[PDB]
Amino acid sequence: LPSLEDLLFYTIAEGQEKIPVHKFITALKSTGLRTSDPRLKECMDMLRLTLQTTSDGVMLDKDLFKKCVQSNIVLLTQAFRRKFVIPDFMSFTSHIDELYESAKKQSGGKVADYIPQLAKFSPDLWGVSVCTVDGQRHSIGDTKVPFCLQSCVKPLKYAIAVNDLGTEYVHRYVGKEPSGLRFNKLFLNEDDKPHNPMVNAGAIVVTSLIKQGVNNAEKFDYVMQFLNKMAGNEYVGFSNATFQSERESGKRNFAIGYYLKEKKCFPEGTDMVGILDFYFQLCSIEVTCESASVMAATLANGGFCPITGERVLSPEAVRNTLSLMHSCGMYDFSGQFAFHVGLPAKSGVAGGILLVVPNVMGMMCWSPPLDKMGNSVKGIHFCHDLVSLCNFHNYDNLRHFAKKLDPRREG
């Protein structure tokens, strides 16, 4: 009748009477969990305070250890006993490292220059962050360098709209399918609605649905307070310089605005020129690979932020978002990507690709050089390789899958 915390103590202890705190921490990191994880704060607080009462500030005997670990014991136990969605995380991150290096050799593409903020980023910035639905984290390359979401925001604001207003309301204004033609084509579907919320027209109408009857200052903070929940309070910023240049060069976008109002695509009472303004702000929100990967993980984890356990989005909002990301998330490459990679992803002109592996993990990949369709060259290459290695394709089978690795099972 041994308690969970007695069990944890004996596994880490390895026959000794006291556990050096450094060894507990080292072991914890090996699971992929960070000591900074919000769900572990109490354990970390207890360790700090309790170690200052100690003669050496290193050694925790059973009862002390049992006390520090109690409040997080189930999570800690899942972690050490290899119960997380990827049980061998160190192995896995080694594979991610190799795919990153491989992608790294692809130096083609051209950095976006429609505004000068984008022009300025070095071609060789390349980072990849992973966050599992259990909050196992890993990064390689440039993962702490801020950049703009640009179109990666589309699926997120659409999720907010569905979360507050429901599917039926939002889809009075916007369709649910791929256009079938080129994204760079201004047109509406059979019922006069933009085809889906991933095309520019659709994202603009969706923008107009959020926090109606309030002002652009309030709308934008409401949206940021949302992205922060999605990211477990990790970095969400704003580029006022991108916002200005986006607005300075907004002719092509305003037309769409005009066209959309003329066809009665906005809700009764819409101030188009302000909606477009709000739309430019949201494109200019800043993330890192690290923080964006938790956002994607929230989407992989059914709307719950994996590093806080907080419900951030309704199930209907998440499911839908993933469905539209599957179909319309990579511009003109969307159908090929669906076919070959088979994961919900969303690209943006800053070089970001937000990727979800449902039930497993989120990922943000970033490299500024873009191919012909406006997708990141390193990012597209990486996403192909991940799915060649691992049985992550939507329509990969979990029992019979050839020479693919399944990271959810142990070697």
Binding site: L1, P2, S3, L4, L7, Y10, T11, I73, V74, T77, Q78, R81, K83
Partner: peptide, 14 residues
């Protein structure tokens, strides 16, 4: 939960 883990692991480890 806590119960499920405690059964499984006491067995395996003890």
């Amino acid at each position: 939960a806590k119960g499920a883990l405690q059964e499984l692991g006491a067995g395996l480890t003890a």
